[PDB]
Amino acid sequence: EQSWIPKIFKKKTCTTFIVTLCQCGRPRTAHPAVATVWDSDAHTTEKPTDAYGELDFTGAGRKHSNFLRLSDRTDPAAVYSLVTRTWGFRAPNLVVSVLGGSGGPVLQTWLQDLLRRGLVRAAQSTGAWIVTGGLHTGIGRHVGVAVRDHQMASKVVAMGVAPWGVVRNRDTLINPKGSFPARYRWRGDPEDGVQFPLDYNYSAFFLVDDGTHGCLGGENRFRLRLESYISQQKTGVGGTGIDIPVLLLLIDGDEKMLTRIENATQAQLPCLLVAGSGGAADCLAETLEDTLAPGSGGARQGEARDRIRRFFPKGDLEVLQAQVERIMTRKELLTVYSSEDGSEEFETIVLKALVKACGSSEASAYLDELRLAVAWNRVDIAQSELFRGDIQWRSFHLEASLMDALLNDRPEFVRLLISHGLSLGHFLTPMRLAQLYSAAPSNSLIRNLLDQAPPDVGHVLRMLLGKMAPWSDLLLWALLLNRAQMAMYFWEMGSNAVSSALGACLLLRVMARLEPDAEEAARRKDLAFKFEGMGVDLFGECYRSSEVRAARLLLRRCPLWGDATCLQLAMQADARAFFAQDGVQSLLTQKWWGDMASTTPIWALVLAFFCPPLIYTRLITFRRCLRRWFHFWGAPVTIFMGNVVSYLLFLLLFSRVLLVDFQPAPPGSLELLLYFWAFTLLCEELRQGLSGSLSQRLRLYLADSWNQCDLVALTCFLLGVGCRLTPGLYHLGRTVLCIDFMVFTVRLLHIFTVNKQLGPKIVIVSKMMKDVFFFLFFLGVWLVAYGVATEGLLRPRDSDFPSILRRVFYRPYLQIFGQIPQEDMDVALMEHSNCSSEPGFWAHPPGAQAGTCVSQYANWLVVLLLVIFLLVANILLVNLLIAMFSYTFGKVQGNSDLYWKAQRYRLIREFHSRPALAPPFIVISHLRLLKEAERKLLTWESVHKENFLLARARDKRESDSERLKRTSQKVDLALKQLGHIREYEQRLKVLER
Ligand SMILES: [Ca+2]
Ligand SMILES: [Ca+2]
């Protein structure tokens, strides 16, 4: 699989001998028989490489480390092609060449923290490369341990170049046919100062061969050539890609490092220097700090720095000064990274260095910098540098960046790119949308839905909602992928803003209910709440602007979201806060009163209902006569009042029949009328269920508690009729009909839900069930204990299971409500008599169900138990229940009010489609049963949304915190200008004298 590797690469040997010890490092005794000044290329022999393979470090590791030995005189193009194609390494978006000596086995804690936190994280984020020394020493060791720490805390392709000869255990790497299995003794016990082990954190190794036993600086030429070639290469895909930025990071160093950085600046490579690193690196930082310092008093400052910031050797020599001057001749390329007391953030510094290194008006040269800015989450640097207006951009130049920002969840970046005159409509294509949807994160819920379902999002939406403009598509994609800021921005640019917000809330809630992550669902619910709040604010502003237009058209309309009104969307989403606002409540009241004025008094309505001619007077404010009659009798409130009156009459008839007319004889006229009335009620309930996708509407109808109560009442009535008509089940029928009448009477509580001050009371009463159950359980346990103890102590002689159960449960239960049979428990209140032959003394209670006679061995204990039971039950439990009720009532007032306001719409919709006749007469009604304006309204809504967003932005900018930020920036700019003025004044004073 590596046949061409020995052919396209070469290895260098010592060949000639140039002295007992050569400059080549190989002794004359072990020297080729072919044996002034040694020459790297003239005194060497080229041979095929015999050290390539994949290293597998013993112990922990990835079992994959491509190692290659190549001669110094090799074109970097072949090496780069080998890495990109044969080894499968992806084209890097960035190459960072960390350089320096870093004398000392350990480095500063702040420096190591900066390395690990900035460089490795940035490389992981952008998929960069880190090219360092391929040895376990100094900066190579530091970057290796930083990469290891980052890896174990989560990959990063951190390569390494090392000279051939300074590598320990080079004997095990030789296999001409391939070293794919390779064991390396990196943990070797012997230690030496000339050969170093290879780090186990590097993905690849390039062993530069120069025909020496091992030295330093022999890989510098190949390193620089590789960096320069990579700097002039595209990110794969041939010429369709963009250039690969290359940056050099220098930490400490020596004269060799100074020559390296000078050559790199000559080769037009951006460089980055860290302040505080040490010698040979802080010298450049101090020189940049001086900047255009005057020669007078600064000419000797160079020698001063060379003597204080560098070692005494070569400090007096001016060759170092010449190198410094050559470096400063091209100071534009390189920059200095201020420590800033451990900033641990240098992505902005890298972006600034890269943007200042190019210096070209063409936008093609800044594509790599824009991609790096998009990969990171900093937008101020990109806007200030790339989008300063000097660079002329284009839609096709920004399309790839927009795609990358969308895929990588960069909301500020997509906002900025769209803001810069980008045609979104022409940008979006079906293939791009398919890519966006395929960019789902791993095995997410949306990914599962896509797999179950060419995006084919219509099927997913139909299966989620029920199935009963690029901005909309982008909003749907963001909601499906759960991107909060993306969804917010897309909604801000939408057309049907209120409907979009309500549908977004519905979709987020229904997907959170379906999401098994148990943590992403919380974020979905939070985003749904945010969208609901935005919709509430927007609709409130629209209603305050024009009540009629908003209330009429904006809600009662069918958009393209689901072909359902906004009220229906809110009801499905259970957006209680949407119904809580005053505009929605006013619209609901207007619909509830129909064609009648919402200010019509209740007594006037009752008088009109009981006096039909009264509707043709000034009492009620709204052919003409028939129209008025149908308007009055079709209003939902009148339907509700008629239904209430009919239900009261039905209950009265039921009570009359059950109490008087219910006889074992065949049913009379009134009983038949009651049967017909119940049949009509059943027909009405069936109509409600069937017309409330048969299964979906049926289960929606069954979801209401009142509908369940009606169904169970009708079932009980049917069972009662069946038992009554049975020849031998009259009593059972009567009993079950009594229970059914109780259920029908309990059904009457639905009336109070209409009243504004009573519905929340009903909701709170419904919520009191937890406290009720707790009290019931505690009371049941205490009753069981006390009853069993008292029954055991008394020892009544009845000993009958029904009587035992009575004396254990029923009597102590009645003792709670003041029914205390003292004469049945206290022996002192009952006469003594002989009843049983059992030993002891017995007394005869006067009660009928208290037993024939009870024991009187320890009756003071019975009295004490009675006292304790009375205390506990009648005081402690009752007061605890009262306290719990008070606490619950105080706690859930607002939630109950919101729930009532939400269900008010459901009630109004239920009574909007009910037949206009009463249930007794509903049989005949059942038998009879069986553009420019839209665009103007949307423009008005969009204008109001824009005004709301502008007002919110103005409020945010006018806040105290933002004002403090702005004044701090102003003070900083003033200080900078004052420093410039001080320098100018000093220069002018120097020149004048
Ligand atoms: Ca560039
Ligand atoms: Ca019903």
Q: For residues 111 and 161, is the Cβ–Cβ distance under 8 A?
A: no
Q: Ligand 2 centre from 696 Cα, in Å?
A: 17
Taking the CA of 354 as reference, the closest ligand is 1
Taking the CA of 356 as reference, the closest ligand is 1
Q: Ligand 2 centre from 896 Cα, in Å?
A: 22
Q: Ligand 2 centre from 686 Cα, in Å?
A: 9
Q: What method was applied to determine this entry?
A: cryo-EM
Angle between helices 430-438 and 395-407 (to 10 degrees): 30
Q: Is 549 annotated as a binding residue?
A: no
Would you give the DSSP letter of residue 946? H
End-to-end Cα, the chain, rounded Å: 77
* Structure tokens, 768: 């009191």
Burial readout 441-470 (b: 16 or more C-beta within 10 A, e: otherwise): eeebbbbebbeeeebebeebbeeebeeeeb
Among candidate residues 403, 394, 400, the one with its CA nearest the CA of residue 423: 394
Neighbours of ion ligand 2 (CB under 5 A): 707, 710
Q: Ligand 1 centre from 354 Cα, in Å?
A: 7
d(CA 377, CA 106): 32
Task: Work out whether the CA dihedral 417, 423, 425, 427 comes out positive or negative.
Answer: negative
Distances (CA, A) of 321 to 300, 305, 318, 326, 972: 10, 10, 5, 9, 35
Q: Is 198 annotated as a binding residue?
A: yes
User: Which residues, including other chains, have CB under 8 Å from residue 949's CB and lie 6 or more apart?
Assistant: 492
d(CA 420, CA 436): 22
Q: Ligand 1 centre from 331 Cα, in Å?
A: 18
Q: For residues 820 and 910, is the Cβ–Cβ distance under 8 A?
A: no
Position 968, amino acid: S
Taking the CA of 913 as reference, the closest ligand is 2
Among candidate residues 404, 79, 82, 98, the one with its CA nearest the CA of residue 242: 404
Taking the CA of 914 as reference, the closest ligand is 2
Q: Ligand 1 centre from 348 Cα, in Å?
A: 15
Question: What SS3 state is found at 337?
Answer: strand
Q: Is 519 annotated as a binding residue?
A: no
Distances (CA, A) of 802 to 215, 443, 806, 808: 105, 62, 6, 10
Question: What SS3 state is found at 185?
Answer: coil
Q: Ligand 1 centre from 357 Cα, in Å?
A: 8
Q: Ligand 1 centre from 367 Cα, in Å?
A: 6
Q: Ligand 2 centre from 710 Cα, in Å?
A: 6
d(CA 649, CA 561): 45
Q: What is 127-177 written as a DSSP string?
A: T-EE-EESSSSHHHHHHHHHHHHHHHT---B--EEEETTSBS-TTTT--TT
For the chain, give me the number of helices (H) and strands (E)? 45, 16
Taking the CA of 906 as reference, the closest ligand is 2
Taking the CA of 747 as reference, the closest ligand is 2
d(CA 257, CA 250): 8
Q: Is 359 annotated as a binding residue?
A: no
What are φ and ψ of residue 45, in 5° steps? Answer: -120, 130
Q: Is 707 annotated as a binding residue?
A: yes
Q: Ligand 1 centre from 356 Cα, in Å?
A: 10
Q: Which residues pair with 208 in a beta bridge?
A: 70, 163
Q: Ligand 1 centre from 274 Cα, in Å?
A: 22
Q: Is 309 annotated as a binding residue?
A: no
Q: Ligand 2 centre from 385 Cα, in Å?
A: 67
Taking the CA of 683 as reference, the closest ligand is 2
Among candidate residues 335, 55, 322, the one with its CA nearest the CA of residue 170: 55
Burial readout 277-309 (b: 16 or more C-beta within 10 A, e: otherwise): bbbbbbbbbbbbeeeeeeeeeeeeebeebbeeb
Taking the CA of 704 as reference, the closest ligand is 2
Taking the CA of 355 as reference, the closest ligand is 1
By residue count, the chain amounts to: 993
Q: Is 210 annotated as a binding residue?
A: no
Q: What is 578-624 written as a DSSP string?
A: HHHSHHHHHHHHHHHTTTS-TT--HHHHHHHHH-GGGGGSTTS---H
Q: Is 377 annotated as a binding residue?
A: no
Q: Is 365 annotated as a binding residue?
A: yes
User: Which residues, including other chains, have CB under 8 Å from residue 344's CB and lie 6 or more apart?
Assistant: 113, 114, 117, 118
Q: Ligand 2 centre from 684 Cα, in Å?
A: 8
d(CA 114, CA 142): 11
- 774-779-784 Cα angle (round to 5): 130
Query: C-alpha dihedral over 601, 605, 610, 615, to 10 degrees?
Result: 110
Among candidate residues 407, 350, 343, 338, the one with its CA nearest the CA of residue 382: 350
Q: Ligand 1 centre from 421 Cα, in Å?
A: 23
Resolution value (Å, 1 decimal): 3.0
Q: Ligand 1 centre from 283 Cα, in Å?
A: 28
Q: Ligand 1 centre from 227 Cα, in Å?
A: 14
Taking the CA of 643 as reference, the closest ligand is 2
Q: Ligand 2 centre from 685 Cα, in Å?
A: 6
